[PDB]
Amino acid sequence: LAEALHQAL
């Protein structure tokens, strides 16, 4: 989830 968020942002 951490990296999913970083990707989105």
Ligand SMILES: [Co+2]
């Ligand atoms: Co990052």
